[PDB]
Structure 1
């Protein structure tokens, strides 16, 4: 048992971490898993207060577990990945066992409504921040749906080629931003956008990201943690895919619950 041929599992979140109410347990293997039923069997999750949940695979090497609804603040979760030498199919076995313990913090849900161009942040049901925002313009719109907060960066470059769009092309970009909080693997961030403050609250001008003001982006970066929720509604976009990496809550319970072990 470590705390967070042969496949190593890697489990998230990390040991003792405090995460938001949208955080799934993630188990990721460094090899494709032929026998998902077996991987699932080998993973034991305990919650306090107890709550029902279920596994769903986002791809061939990574499985997720979450309840039906967002976690209750204060819940404590223990994850025991008992895979050492377990038959994982096609002559691959677990390299080791792994475990983690984490807790759920405050309920933090930020809702970006394209009808108002306001991103409103709610802590335990109390509006604590209202941020004018400027989202994806019509030709490169922001997808509707529930996004899980992922990592955060004081400064990074977002480069469109990372997502299959050349920098040189009409929808391309290579952009330095401050106070960048990632909310989808497909490239959506809430981040500082001093170049669209006139538009924020009025007009969509971005490639998909939630532009807010320098001090609202910094506030968001300071007060939000991995697992918190950004709900986007009413854009002319599609829906964020359930298998994004941070889209898990867009898969309806009945479909999630049934799983996809085979």
Structure 2
């Protein structure tokens, strides 16, 4: 009957133009509207935004468009003592302030097989890439950048898919930037450097050169944007965890507080 909120991004962080505000609770929220009413988001410059629930425990807030760089955001989660439905009360308040850094948008175009990185509108890198093969294609859409890893084992059994099964995989990779909670990454692939710019070889990750993956790891930050276009895949789900922007604003703004 007590629930604790946690807010991301953290206090003092600088994040990319795609970063939503996230308020995650440790129990299911029976009255979503009660939660929304208790969360006050201040923006400077002021912009409209709206809430949308990813699941029963997490609500997201963002504007219609990507954030303007340099925007200052204050989040006041005033849930201490608040009835969140079915006699579940908020355990504490949270107050976070964060800021929007430079606009970093990287676009991966399957017709060119180049990942182009623009910073405040200017091309800074043009990276040949190898994306998902036709049987395991990379979904088109807007992905928010998440965590980064110097080295990681990408193992399909993390997601309940046995390695030696049709959708399975296991690969050790360096310089990995996470772009979906479902396990899509930008990463180093020295083994596919010939194919990059020519042929799709991955199970859905964007394979780039080691130096380009390290560059990406070093210079792209949480909340920056990767857009995938022109692939033979479908579309990144809006409720992936990093796929928020795939939900159209009209649907997002209407919300799902009654669902």
Residue aligned with 2:218, SS: helix
2:80, 2:10 → 1: CA distance? Answer: 19
After superposition, what is the alpha-carbon deviation per residue over 1:210-251, rounded to whole angstroms, capped at 9, x for unaligned?
000000000000000000000000000000000000000000
d(CA) in 2 for partners of 1:222, 1:47:
28
Structure 1 unaligned segments of length 5 or more: list them: none
Runs of 5+ consecutive residues of structure 2 not aligned to the other structure: none
Runs of 4+ in 1 over 4 A off after TM superposition: none
The residue matched to 1:96 in structure 2 has which SS?
coil
TM-score, length of structure 1 as denominator length? 0.98
Q: Kindly provide the CA deviation profile for residues 52-84 of structure 1, in whole angstroms up to 9, marking residues without a partner as x.
A: 000000000000000000000000000000000
In 2, the alpha carbon distance for the partners of 1:234 and 1:162 equals: 28
**How far apart are residue 170 of structure 1 and its match?**
3.4
TM-score, length-scaled by structure 2? 0.99
For residues 150 and 31 of structure 1, the distance between their equivalents in structure 2, rounded to whole angstroms, comes to 23
Are 2:150 and 1:154 equivalent residues in the alignment?
yes
Aligned mates of 2:104, 2:195 — CA distance in 1: 26
Partners of 2:161 and 2:209 in 1: CA distance: 26
CA distance in 1, matches of 2:241, 2:179: 9
Task: Provide the rounded CA distance (Å) in 2 between the counterparts of 1:204 and 1:164.
Answer: 25
Distance in 2, Cα, partners of 1:23 & 1:104: 8
Q: Which residue of 1 aligns with 2:168?
A: 172
What is the Cα deviation at residue 195 of structure 1?
1.2
Distance 1:143 1:43 in 2: 33
Q: Deviation string for 1:102-133 (max 9, x for gaps)?
A: 00000000000000000000000000000000
How many angstroms apart in 1 are the aligned matches of 2:27 and 2:53?
14
Structure-2 separation of matches of 1:239 and 1:164: 21
Q: CA deviation at 1:174?
A: 1.6
Give SS of 2:174's match: strand
In the TM superposition, 1:102-181 aligns within 5 A as 102-181=98-177
